Structures are given as structure tokens and as C-alpha cells.
Design a protein around this ligand. Sequence first.
Ligand code: CLA
Ligand code: CLA
Ligand code: CLA
Ligand code: CLA
Ligand SMILES: CC1=C(C#C/C(C)=C/C=C/C(C)=C/C=C/C=C(C)/C=C/C=C(C)/C=C/C2=C(C)CCCC2(C)C)C(C)(C)C[C@H](O)C1
Ligand SMILES: CC1=CCCC(C)(C)[C@H]1/C=C/C(C)=C/C=C/C(C)=C/C=C/C=C(C)/C=C/C=C(C)/C=C/C1=C(C)CCCC1(C)C
Ligand SMILES: CC1=CCCC(C)(C)[C@H]1/C=C/C(C)=C/C=C/C(C)=C/C=C/C=C(C)/C=C/C=C(C)/C=C/C1=C(C)CCCC1(C)C
Ligand SMILES: CC1=CCCC(C)(C)[C@H]1/C=C/C(C)=C/C=C/C(C)=C/C=C/C=C(C)/C=C/C=C(C)/C=C/C1=C(C)CCCC1(C)C
Ligand code: SF4
Ligand code: SF4
Ligand code: SF4
Lengths: 80, 34, 175, 172, 169, 90, 586, 30
Amino acid sequence: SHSVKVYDTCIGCTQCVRACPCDVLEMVSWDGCKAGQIASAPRTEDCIGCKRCETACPTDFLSVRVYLGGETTRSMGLAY
Amino acid sequence: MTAAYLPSILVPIIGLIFPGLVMAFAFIYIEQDE
Amino acid sequence: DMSASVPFLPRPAALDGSMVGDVGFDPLGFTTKYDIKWLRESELKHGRVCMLASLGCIVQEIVHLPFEATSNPVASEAFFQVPAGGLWQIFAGIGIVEHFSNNFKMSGSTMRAPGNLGFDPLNFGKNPSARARYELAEIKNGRLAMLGFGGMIHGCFITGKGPIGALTSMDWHQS
Amino acid sequence: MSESVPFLKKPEALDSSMAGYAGFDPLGLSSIADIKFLQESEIKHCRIAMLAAAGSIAQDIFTFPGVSKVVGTAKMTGVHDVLVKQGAMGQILLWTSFLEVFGTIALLETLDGKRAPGDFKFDPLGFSKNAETAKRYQLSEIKNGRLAMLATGGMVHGYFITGKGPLELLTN
Amino acid sequence: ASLDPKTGFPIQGGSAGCQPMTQAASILDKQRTVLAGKITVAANKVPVLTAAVDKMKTAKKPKLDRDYVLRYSALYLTTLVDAMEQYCLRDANGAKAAGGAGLPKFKETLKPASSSSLYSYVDTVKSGIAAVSAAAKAGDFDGVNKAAGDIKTAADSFLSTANPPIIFN
Amino acid sequence: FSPVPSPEGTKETYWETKAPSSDVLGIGAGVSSGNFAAASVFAALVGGYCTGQVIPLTVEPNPLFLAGSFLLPYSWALHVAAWIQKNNGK
Amino acid sequence: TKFPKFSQALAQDPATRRIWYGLATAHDLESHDGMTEENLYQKIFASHFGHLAVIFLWTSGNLFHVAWQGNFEQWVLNPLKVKPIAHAIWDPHFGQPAVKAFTKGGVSYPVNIATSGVYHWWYTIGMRSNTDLYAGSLFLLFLAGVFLFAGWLHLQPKFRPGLSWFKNNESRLNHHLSGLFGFSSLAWSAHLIHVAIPEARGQHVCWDNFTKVAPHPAGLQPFFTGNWGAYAASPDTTNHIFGTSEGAGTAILTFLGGFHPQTQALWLTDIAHHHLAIGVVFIFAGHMYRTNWGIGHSLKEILDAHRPPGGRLGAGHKGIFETLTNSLHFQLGLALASLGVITSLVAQHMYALPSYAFIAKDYVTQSALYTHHQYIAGFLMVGAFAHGAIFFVRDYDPEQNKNNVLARILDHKEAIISHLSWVSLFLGFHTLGIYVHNDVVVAFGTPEKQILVEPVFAQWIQASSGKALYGFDVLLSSTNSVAANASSNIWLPGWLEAINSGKNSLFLPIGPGDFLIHHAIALALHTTTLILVKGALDARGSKLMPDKKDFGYAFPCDGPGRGGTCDISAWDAFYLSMFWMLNTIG
Amino acid sequence: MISDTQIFIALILALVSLVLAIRLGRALYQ
Ligand code: CLA
Ligand code: CLA
Ligand code: CLA
Ligand code: CLA
Ligand SMILES: CC1=C(C#C/C(C)=C/C=C/C(C)=C/C=C/C=C(C)/C=C/C=C(C)/C=C/C2=C(C)CCCC2(C)C)C(C)(C)C[C@H](O)C1
Ligand SMILES: CC1=CCCC(C)(C)[C@H]1/C=C/C(C)=C/C=C/C(C)=C/C=C/C=C(C)/C=C/C=C(C)/C=C/C1=C(C)CCCC1(C)C
Ligand SMILES: CC1=CCCC(C)(C)[C@H]1/C=C/C(C)=C/C=C/C(C)=C/C=C/C=C(C)/C=C/C=C(C)/C=C/C1=C(C)CCCC1(C)C
Ligand SMILES: CC1=CCCC(C)(C)[C@H]1/C=C/C(C)=C/C=C/C(C)=C/C=C/C=C(C)/C=C/C=C(C)/C=C/C1=C(C)CCCC1(C)C
Ligand code: SF4
Ligand code: SF4
Ligand code: SF4
């Protein structure tokens, strides 16, 4: 699977989760940012590696970071 | 040429049997799981 | 502390006087780099082969088989003169003895006390203490034989006469 | 300050206990090379030169049976040129080199400090038993060796310039 | 029973059993078949030179190639003489030339290649080398041809009187 | 990533001072700066002389002048050592 | 599901990508699962012995196929007229016109004509017959077996070298300089003096007679007296016919210079004296480092002490010792940059100074050898920069390398890359512009208007080495010069003959076309360096991707965000510079 | 010229090299 990380520079804008086509990311409560929430990745096995979450990230360096790793049928986007 | 028979004997073996056999074995090894 | 053979040099650590023929003579430190048992078994094998060779060269001058290609006084010349197939037969036969000996184990596998193949049919060594004296005698005779055989094989190369001829006839009054 | 050379400073690596000490090291070469290495090198030079000085003298006095036939008239260095063509120079070189191979091991022990510089424990006759006679005799060996080093060069250069040889140069 | 014309190896097997363990041949005899085979290769390359010199003479403008004649002499004729000298050495002194006196060295202290019954043929081939070179300097095509023929006759004569044992081994 | 070995007697030679410590001279650490400066000028003159006397090189050059000609580059390292020793108070 | 046994991430891939990636990552032993450093260095050691053996099997194959199927003995008789045979053709797809068309070389079978020059090399070094080419093939098969057994043996538990052995820099350098470089160059002088020199002079010398045949008539007595110049006395005459006794001298070591007048190659006595000189030099250089007896240099001490007191290099080379030793990619990059420069030297010096007899009249061989070694040169140089990029990504630790030469190179990475961009653009705009100016003016019927710039600097260099064509009268070209007078008694007469004669490729005449193409090559070398240097310096990060190090050396992109990140990896700058390498060697 | 026996000796030594190559490849592969 791919490995998806969220760094503590996340402002909790929820945009990376909305971008996610594969329900990899979700919002959890976090007191670090003003929004009271940070992104989380409890479903990186469904991560295809599209990196749409990275594009939606408005932080200077993407708080969400996809690291392409081992490929599976799910992470390869194979309908066969 | 001395041993002129050897090019006729080896070139088909090295050029057809060798790849065929090693491709067959390589195919079996790459596909196998255990 | 200090080697008996070389007083200035220190005694080699992996010697200790336990083996026969131990005067502390390992200046080049082979014992450190290489196993003592392999060195000892090789020393005994070299000396035993040399003792047969030292006897062989002298005997071959004094008496030979009554055939052509075996009538050469000089040892080195005799090697090339004798049937080569016979030489290759000797080499393989010695190889069978070498495989038979050491339980078919060579290098690390063999190490059986070094230099013993269990070849003692006759009870020449009635006492074990006498056998220890014989073991010292064997190694000292083997060492002498190594130097001796090299000395007469080189005598054959220069004199071209064989060992006993080489001692008896030298260029005493010739440049 | 130094004993031998009053103007210069006492050599730092040199001590009174050491044999043949006169505090003589004007160029300070003891700092440059290890003093134990230098000490053994001096003793090796001392002994080879001592044999060489007496050698030249003895060869002028007399030769061994047959050497005169092998070398017609050459002496000192010239006989060496004849003996490389024969086997004497090579055979001595092979045996001296073999002893020097053990000498290399001994030099390594000296650099370690296990062995005294130049001490090969060669006493067939024990003339250094007293241990103060040993100090004196080591001083004598060093002094006669330094003199012989000078002397060997002196008589060999006399051969180079005149061809006479050491005793013959005085007689002629 | 004979030596191959080109490769020079033993040709046919044809208690003196050829098989290694039972071989009765000495290392001297095996060295002699090696030398005889090398003599055979060098002698059988003499027709090639004869053909080349004939091609040179029949050309529209004919010039002797001193470089070809001298390089052929250097490559085969000198080799033929050295192989024959070694066979003569082994025939005369005996086992000593086979390594009985040690490594090949100067002052080998063994009987010379001369005083051998087969040495006269070696002298003929040496004369042939001298004639091949002299003709090449002169530009004489016929001289090279006859000189090579003299070498060919001498080498064949050497092998016939030698009767070398062929050790298939 | 694993301990990198160095020969026994390896010591620290990184310097940020005016001159490196004399330990960078190895066996020449105890030589005085005057002795290097005099050896440097001596080596420059004898090396330059030995170099100069064999500039037209022949098939028979004097081997002592060849060996003595090596003192010219050696003199460069000698005066660098002279500078190091003077700035270490030696 | 188990083919990449070294990679569980690939062995669980259900696609055809697993086969490709397992094949392509097979030799990257550092990335294999559960890889320790001990096992990494021991597998590299054993696989280096396998490369050694492959090289020896390849050379034994060339020797065997020439001994068996070549015309070596026909070629050595007449080397300027006969075309060398590489190997025979047995192809069941051939027609009978094809079989007849390839039956050249003086033989009765189809053949490939060799462009490798191995005939000229084997001729020059002594080989005369098929029996000794075959003997060389046999010996290399034995050596290949010896190094295959050594590779297996050094994988056995008692014979496994430790990491302390693999990183003994001083003992490895001492032995590779004094034994591998120096003693084998000295041994190569022995081969020339004992074998190649006598057999170039007609006298056969083999294992059968080389201990009873003296290379010199006096014979090791002038060497052991200091009468070394007696080994240069009576050199080979200008009338010498190579391979024969006519015109031959007795010298075994000379410095004649120039070329043998017949073979148009360097004198073999010059080559024997070259390897003796370079051998003694390398042997002396192999006593530099301290191993076990207290004399020599510690490499750590040398690197730490070379920091200029002006502070312009920062901490200098403090910590470079550890970085080099710990980083196999830094070593590979130094080795490949060094090797790439040498095979470029090999290509440039072997066409201008050929060493092999009757080559440089084999125009196909000269063209193939130059082209071959320049392409190998471009591959090695690009790979050196590739493994410098891999070094930065994988093995470079900034904390261990604080303010070094390496950190300070990264600190000004933009000054380096932007000035390489400038010089690339500078050269490209002008060289192309002058070329296009020339094309447009010649097209318009006005060749005189062409901007033709003489290569005066290079011509001055040629003249400084003795070319009299340009009339510079500098150094060697001037008869009354200190430089000219110094070499007059030794190598200058031969060199002046060689350089001034127009029959050789030594310092070939250069004009405006040469200038323009050299500037084109400057643009190409600078542009390939720009791409490779940009890849190496930006390997660990950039403004576009700051954390590029975390992704590795070869990754596809970072996606379409931030404008687009295609070809952003350091591997992709290898990829882009490979085209520029091909263009420059083109 | 090269004999058929000489070619067979070369083929024997290359087979020995093949066996040693197999043994090294198996050792490197583990
Ligand atoms: C590199 C070595 C090599 C060799 C030695 C050959 C040999 C041959 N090819 Mg070629 N070929 C090769 C590579 C090779 N091929 C490659 C790489 C390609 C693709 C570009 C081709 C494409 C090709 C075509 C398109 C044709 C040939 C043909 C031929 C035959 C020559 C014509 C003839 O006399 O007909 C006489 C041929 C026969 C009587 C056929 C004999 C059949 C053999 C002996 C049976 C072997 C059993 C088989 C190998 C079992 C292997 C199993 C596997 C595990 C290895 C001959 C058998 C022609 C052909 O097939 O001939 C009919 C033909 O039309 N080849
Ligand atoms: C004298 C002692 C000695 C010698 C000879 C060698 C030799 C070698 N070692 Mg080393 N090694 C030694 C001691 C020695 N070692 C010690 C003491 C250690 C431990 C500290 C090591 C540790 C060590 C390691 C860790 C490794 C080696 C490796 C190697 C091999 C290098 C690969 C190769 O083919 O390069 C050959 C290089 C040359 C022949 C010289 C290059 C010539 C330059 C580049 C240009 C010259 C061009 C010239 C004209 C050539 C023309 C050819 C002709 C066609 C014209 C080589 C066989 C490596 C290897 O492959 O393992 C087997 C390796 O990984 N060694
Ligand atoms: C006049 C404005 C200007 C100035 C002062 C510079 C200054 C510089 N540029 Mg250039 N550059 C400019 C415009 C300018 N740039 C433009 C518009 C582009 C896009 C084509 C570039 C593309 C560019 C590249 C690709 C490179 C530089 C480099 C450099 C540096 C080296 C100097 C050099 O060789 O120039 C080289 C100049 C060019 C290659 C392009 C020239 C572009 C035209 C001629 C200038 C534009 C005129 C502008 C419209 C003026 C309008 C003002 C008017 C309204 C009053 C230097 C910092 C190089 C560098 O970093 O090296 C250190 C380098 O590699 N520049
Ligand atoms: C003919 C083919 C060609 C040409 C000309 C170039 C040109 C260039 N490449 Mg490219 N490249 C090519 C093929 C080519 N490449 C290919 C096939 C690859 C493999 C993918 C690459 C990969 C590559 C990389 C990876 C890099 C380059 C770089 C460069 C530059 C190197 C020369 C330089 O710095 O200044 C020379 C400049 C020129 C030759 C430009 C020509 C000047 C123009 C034509 C002026 C004309 C004005 C005219 C009025 C326009 C009319 C337009 C009309 C519509 C009005 C330059 C822009 C490097 C770079 O940018 O370094 C700074 C770089 O990093 N190239
Ligand atoms: C070449 C060659 C050969 C040879 C050979 C040999 C044996 C060569 C040996 C050469 C030697 C040993 C030369 C010695 C020179 C000593 C000197 C200059 C010291 C002088 C004293 C000084 C400066 C000051 C002293 C001092 C005095 C005065 C007072 C002040 C204090 C003090 C310091 C005490 C062969 C045999 C191989 C033959 C071959 O064919 C050719
Ligand atoms: C250490 C020591 C201790 C005490 C003091 C000491 C005595 C002074 C000192 C000794 C010192 C010294 C100097 C000791 C010296 C020892 C030396 C130099 C020994 C020489 C050995 C050579 C041999 C055995 C050759 C054998 C050849 C064979 C089998 C075959 C040859 C042949 C081959 C190739 C093929 C077959 C046929 C032929 C042609 C015959
Ligand atoms: C890339 C590669 C992979 C893994 C890593 C690696 C190991 C380091 C590397 C190395 C690869 C290497 C080095 C590969 C090396 C490959 C080699 C050397 C292959 C040699 C093959 C020779 C053959 C099949 C000859 C057979 C002869 C015969 C059967 C004759 C027999 C006979 C004849 C007729 C006459 C005599 C009697 C008999 C016995 C009857
Ligand atoms: C990217 C990368 C990242 C970090 C790691 C890394 C691997 C190290 C690195 C790679 C770096 C790479 C790949 C670096 C590549 C570096 C290269 C190829 C350097 C070339 C150097 C050549 C020189 C200095 C020639 C000097 C000639 C001279 C002085 C001739 C003089 C003369 C003589 C003697 C004779 C003629 C007269 C004159 C002219 C006077
Ligand atoms: S987009 Fe970047 S910032 Fe907005 S939530 Fe997802 S991670 Fe946190
Ligand atoms: S990569 Fe595509 S799938 Fe994986 S997390 Fe970012 S958005 Fe969701
Ligand atoms: S296009 Fe460029 S960015 Fe989009 S995926 Fe392919 S490479 Fe990555």
C-alpha cells in the first residue's frame, strides 16, 4: 500500500479529505490548529496514490504527504 | 575449419534451446508463489 | 616469553611446547594466521614424502629395475625417462591413499590428531613413551629429509649425476 | 646543554644510560626518526663495518686457498665484481638476507619495545656476565663500530682513488 | 600413426596401451611427439610460401615482397629450426633435456644439439633460411622457391629418420 | 554507518588556528623552524644546482644529480613546515 | 509471488510490474529487504569476482574464436593486406549469395571482419601462432575459474571478510598502487622486454626458452652496476621490418619518441621503458599509507588537515574521510568519473599515439576503437554524476558533513547551476549562431562572409609541442629554445619527426571548422554537466519539492499539483542528460 | 591450427568455469 502522512502544520481546512476519491482521509479532533481538527489517514490501503489531497493542501508545504509504496490491486486502480 | 561440425551443433542449441529452456524456467520461477 | 631457538624473538603464543619438536621456532608468525594442526599435519606429510624421496634418490642411483626407461642414475632425469602412464598411476594411487586417509575430509573438516593416519601395523612402538620419542625422531628426520631432498634434487639439476655421485665427485681442483 | 657540542643544546632523545652517549646530535635527526630504529640501525652499521674494516685488513694480509686463482689481482671492491660472476657474493647475500628476515621480525619487536635495539642475545662465550662489563663492552662495540664505519669508508675510498687496498696503501 | 598436416596433433590410435593409466610412453617421448608435431606444422606451411611467390612472379608487374618472405621466415622457418634443434638435443643427451637438468638456463651443462645423428638436416634448414633471406633481398623469385623446397625436403628427411613415437595419450 | 578504521596512531589534525599543530608534520613534529628553514634553503640550492647541471639530459646522466634534483619539490614542503613550526613557537 | 525474494513489496504486487521491477532492482543490493552492511559489502565483493570472470571469459572467447576461426597466422605474415577475422558465421537464414559475400579473409567460410583491433594488439605483444592465442584463451578460462571459485569462497562463513577489512583504506590503496598498478606495470615491462621485444625482432621466446634466452646480450649485469644506459644502446634501426631480425637492435629500454617507421606505432622499447617508469612511480606511491609498521600517512589525518587558513572552504575536508568510506555511491562516482576521463584519454591518445603494429592503417579499426571508447567514456561520466546524485539522496548526512566542501557545494548549489546555465546558453547561442551565420551566408552564395575563427590557442599548443605548420616558433617549434634544447638529446628528434610529418594523427591540422566543433563539444559537455549537476545538487530537495530526499532517487513525480512535477527526480535528470551524452559523443 | 582435441580441452575448462559460475550465482543468490 501507499503511506499517507499528515503533519502538524495542517490547518484543518478539510480540503484534502474532500479531494480524496477513495475515502482514505478523515477528520479527527486536534487542538493544534484554530479549526480544532486535523486530517487522518486510517484507510491508506484504498489510497490509489492520485495525490489529489496534495493539490488541495493550501499549506506552503503539503501537510498531507503521499509516499508511493508497494502496489496492490487496490492501489493500482485495477478493475480487473 | 577444424571442428566445423560444432557451429552447426551449438548455434541452434545456444540460440533456440538455451533461450527456450531458460525462458520456460524463468517463467516458472517468476510465476511460482512458494 | 622468549623463543628457545631464537633468544631475541618472543616465544610464539600458539606453540607452548605441547607438540613434539617445539623450540619456539615460529618467527614469521604462521601459527597466528594459520591453524597449528594443519601446519603440523602438512609438516608430517612433507617430511614423510621427503623421507621416502631422500631414500628414493640414493637407492635409485645404487640399484634400479632391469629395464630400459628405468636405468637412469639421476632422479630428475628418471622422472621424465620412466613411463608417464606409470607416473600418472602413482599420482592417482597416492590420491586414493589421500582420500582414504583423513576420512575423506580436507582443510577445516579433518580437524584425528595431526599427522597420524593410524598406519602402525607392526608393534615397533612397544611403549607409548617410546612412541613419543619416535614421534620426535620422525619429525626431526622428516625436517632433515626436507632440506636433504631439496639439496640433492638441486644437486641433480647442477651435477646431473645424482646424490651419491654429487658428493663423491665435486670440482675440488676445478674452478 | 650538550657534552660533545658545547654551543648546541642537549639532544632531547639522547640519554647518558644509552651506550656511546656523548650528547652528539647536531642536526637533531633523533626527532625525525624513531630513536630505537636509529639505535638498531647504528648497531647494524657498526657490526657490518667492524667486520668490513677487519675484512679489508685481513684480505691484504692473506687470502684463503684458491681465492687468488678466482680473482687475479682485484682487491677490496674489485674482488666483489669478480665474485658476483662466481657464486660467493650471491651465497653470502642469500644467507645474510635470511638472517635479516629474522632481523626484520626483531626490528618489529624493538619498535614495540619488547627487544633492546641491536640485542640479538648472541653470547656463545659469556663475556658480558658481569653486567657492568656489558655496559663497557657495549660502549666499546659502539665506539669501535663507529671508528670502523669511518675506517671502512676511508680504506675503500683509498682503493677507489689508488687501487692499492688498505695495508698496501700504507706500504706503497 | 602420423601427425596431422595442419594442426600437428596425433592422428589415429591404430603393453604400450595408449590409455593414460597403461601408457608406456615416457615424458621424453611425449615431448618428442610435441616437437615433431610442431616440425610437421612448420614444414607443411612451406607450400603456402611457394604458392605466394608464384603469385608474385606471375603478376603484371612483379616484385618480391621482402616483408612477406622475411615475416614468413621469422614465423615458420625459425620455428622449424628451433623445434628440430630441440629434438636433436633430446636425441643426443637423452632425458636431461626433458627437464632432468632443471629449468632451461644458460650453461645448462648438457650435450649440445650438435653431435646428434639428425643434426645434419638442421644444418640444411639453416642454409635454407639464409637462402630465403638472401633471395628476398636480391629480388630473385626462383631463389625463394628452391630454398623453401630445400627446407621442405630436409624437414621430411628429419622426420623419416627420427621415427617419432606418436603419443595419442 | 559502521566504525571506519584508521591506522594506530591516528590523531586529530583539524585546525582553525594560524598554523596547524606540529603533529601534521608527522615524524618532523619536533624539528625546529630554523632547522626546516635552513633545510629548505639548502634543498632549494642543491636541488636547483642538481637539476640545472643535467638539464640537457643525456643517455648517461649522473644518478646523484638526478636524485639530488628531487630536493627542489622537497624544499617547498620544507618551507611550508618551516612556516608551521615558526607559528607554533618551535 | 516470490521472484523478487529481495523485495516483499514487489513480491506481493499482483501485476506484471513485479517482474519488471524485480529485474530492474536486482543489483541495488542496498535496497533489499533486511540488508545489513556486512552482507552488502560481501555480496558486492563476490559479484565483483563474477564481473572479473565475465571479463576473462569474454577475452578467452575472443582469443579462442580468433585461434579457431580467424586468419591470425595468415594476417601476421602480411598485416597490411589481410583483413582480420573475428569469428565465423553459421546462420541458417543466409542465402547462398550471403554465404558467398561473407567468405572474405582468405578462408572458405563466411566470417565477420574484426574491427576490435585485437589482431594488432596480439601481434604487437608477441603472439605469432594460433597455438599461443589458444594458450591465452585457455589461461583466461583457468583465471575465470579461479575468480569464480574465489567469488564462491569469499561467500563461505570462515572466509567472509569483515567490514573492518572492506574499509581498510590504507592497505587497499597501498596494495592497489604498488601491486595492482605498479607491479603489474613492471610485470608488463617484463613481458615486453622478455617476449614482445624479442619477437618483434624475429627471435621466438616462449615459456620453453625464456629462462635460457637473455633479453639483452650483456644481461642484468648493466642493471646491477648502474650502467642503465647500456640498455638503450643500439636501438632498432629505421630499416627494421617488424617481426623479423633485419634492422633489429639490441636495446630493450629507449626514449626515442615518435613512431616505428614501418608499423607507424610507438616503439615497443619506448612502451617497455614507459611501463618500467610508471611501474616504479606507482610502486613508490603505494608506500604512502600507514598499515602495520608505523611509517606512512593516515588518510584521516591528511583530509582533516587540509583546510585553508583563510576560511574560504569552511571546515575544508573534515568529515570527508568518513563520508567517502561509508558511501559506496560516493566511491562509485569518484571511480566512474576517474575511469570516464581515462577511457576518454584512451580514445584520444590511442588514435594520435597508436601502440599496435600496423594499426592506424586499419581505418575501420581506428574508427571503431575511438567511437567505442568515447561512448564508454560518456556512459561512465554520466554514471559518475548519477551515483553522485544517489550519494546525496542516500548516503549524505548533513550533520556529519557540517560546513565541509560538500555542504558548501550544496550551500551555493544555485550559483553553480545558474553559472552552468549561463555558460551552456552562452556557448549554445553563439556556436549555433556562428554556424547558422555560416550556413545562411554560404547558401546566399557568399562563403567569404562566413565567420571563420582560427583555433589559435590550440595551434599555439601544437606549436609548443613542435608543430611547424602554424609558424608560432614557441618552445619545441623554435629550434633555439630552453625546452627544445633540453629534450634534444632524448625524445625530441623522434617527436619532431612524428608531429611535423602529416602521415599520422598526432596533432592533426586544425582550422575554423575545428574551432566551431570544439565549441559545440564545450556546449555539450557543459549542458550534460548542467543537467547532471542540477540533478545531483537538487537530488535532496528543491523549492518545487523540499522533501525530495524522502522519496528516493527514482520516483515518477509528485503529481500534477504545484503546477506539475514531471521529471522532478534526480533519476530524471540522469534520464535527460543521457540524451545530452549521446548528443555530445555524437 | 587448433585441433579438435584442443577445442575439447577448451570446452572442458569452460564447463568447469560454468559449474563454478553456477556455484557463485547460487551463493550470491543465497
Ligand atoms: C538465433 C538462432 C536461430 C537459429 C539457429 C534458427 C534456425 C532456423 N530458423 Mg530462425 N529465427 C530466430 C532464431 C533462430 N532460428 C529468431 C530469433 C526469429 C525471430 C526473428 C526467427 C524467425 C524465423 C522464421 C520466421 C523462420 C526461421 C527459420 C529457421 C530455420 C532455417 C530454414 C531451414 O532450413 O528450414 C528447415 C527448418 C526445419 C526443418 C525446422 C526444424 C524444426 C526444429 C529442428 C525442431 C526443434 C524443436 C523445438 C526447438 C523444441 C524447442 C522447445 C523449447 C523448450 C526450446 C532454422 C530451423 C524458417 C523456418 O522455420 O524453417 C521452416 C522460417 O520460416 N526463423
Ligand atoms: C597487490 C595486492 C592486491 C592486488 C593485486 C589486488 C587486486 C584487485 N583487488 Mg584488491 N585488495 C588488496 C590487495 C590487492 N588487490 C588488499 C590488501 C585489500 C584489503 C585492504 C583489498 C581489498 C579489495 C576490495 C574490497 C576489492 C578489491 C578488488 C580488487 C580487484 C579490482 C578489480 C579489477 O579488475 O581491477 C583491475 C584494475 C587494473 C588492472 C588497473 C586499472 C588500470 C587503469 C584503470 C588504467 C590502465 C590502462 C592500461 C593501459 C590497461 C590496458 C589493458 C590493455 C587492454 C591495453 C583486483 C583484482 C575489488 C574486486 O573486484 O574484488 C574482486 C574489490 O571489491 N580489493
Ligand atoms: C533586461 C532584463 C534582464 C536582465 C538584467 C537579466 C539578467 C540576468 N539573466 Mg536573464 N532573462 C531575462 C531578462 C533579464 N535577465 C528574460 C526576459 C528571460 C527570459 C527569456 C531571461 C532568461 C534567462 C536565463 C535562461 C538565464 C538568464 C541569466 C541571467 C544572468 C546572467 C546575465 C546574462 O547572461 O543574461 C542572459 C540573458 C538571457 C539568456 C535572455 C535575454 C533576454 C532578453 C534579451 C532581455 C529582455 C529585455 C527586457 C524585455 C527589457 C524590458 C525593459 C524595458 C521595458 C525598459 C543575469 C542575472 C542566466 C543565469 O542565471 O546565469 C547566471 C541564465 O541562465 N536569464
Ligand atoms: C536541436 C535540438 C535541441 C536544441 C537546440 C536544444 C536547445 C537547448 N537545450 Mg535541449 N534537448 C533536446 C534537443 C535540443 N535542445 C533533446 C532532444 C533533449 C532530450 C530530452 C533535450 C534536453 C535538454 C535538457 C534537459 C536541457 C536542455 C538544455 C538546452 C539548452 C542548451 C543550449 C543552451 O543553453 O543555449 C542554447 C540556446 C539555444 C540553442 C536556443 C536557440 C535560440 C533561438 C532559436 C533564438 C531564435 C529566435 C527566433 C526569432 C524565434 C522565432 C520564433 C517565431 C515564432 C517568431 C538549449 C535551450 C539545457 C538548458 O536549458 O540549459 C540552460 C537543459 O537543462 N535540453
Ligand atoms: C661502489 C662499489 C662497491 C663498494 C663499496 C663500499 C664499502 C662503500 C663504502 C663507502 C663508505 C663507508 C663511505 C664512508 C664515508 C664516511 C664519511 C664521509 C665520514 C666522514 C667524517 C666526517 C665528515 C667528520 C668526522 C669528524 C672529525 C674529522 C672531527 C669532528 C668530529 C667528527 C664528526 C668525528 C662494491 C664493493 C660493490 C664494488 C662495486 O663494483 C662498486
Ligand atoms: C631454518 C633453519 C633452522 C636452523 C638453522 C638453519 C639450518 C641454517 C636454517 C635453514 C635454513 C635454510 C636456508 C633452509 C633451506 C631450505 C630449502 C631452500 C629447501 C629447498 C627445497 C626444494 C625442494 C624440496 C624441491 C623439490 C623438487 C621436486 C619435488 C621436484 C622437482 C621436479 C619437478 C618440478 C617435476 C618432477 C621432476 C623434477 C624435475 C625433479
Ligand atoms: C551473469 C552471471 C550470473 C550470476 C552471477 C555470476 C555467476 C557472477 C554471473 C556469471 C556468469 C558466468 C561466468 C557464466 C559462464 C558461463 C559458461 C562458462 C558457460 C560454459 C559452457 C560450456 C559448455 C556447456 C561446454 C560443455 C562441454 C562438454 C559437455 C564436453 C564434454 C566432453 C567432450 C565432448 C570431450 C571430453 C569428454 C566429454 C566430457 C564427453
Ligand atoms: C556529482 C557528485 C556529487 C557528490 C559526489 C561526487 C561523485 C564526487 C560528484 C561527482 C563529481 C564528478 C562526476 C566529477 C567529475 C570531475 C572531473 C571529470 C574532473 C576532471 C578533472 C580534470 C582535470 C583536473 C585535468 C587537469 C589537467 C591538467 C592540470 C593538465 C595540465 C597540463 C599538463 C600536466 C600537460 C599539458 C600542459 C598542462 C595543461 C599544463
Ligand atoms: S488539506 Fe492540507 S491542511 Fe487542509 S486539511 Fe487536508 S491536510 Fe490539513
Ligand atoms: S492520494 Fe488520492 S487517494 Fe490516496 S489519499 Fe491523497 S487523495 Fe485520497
Ligand atoms: S503527468 Fe507528470 S505529473 Fe501527472 S503523473 Fe505523469 S508525471 Fe506525474
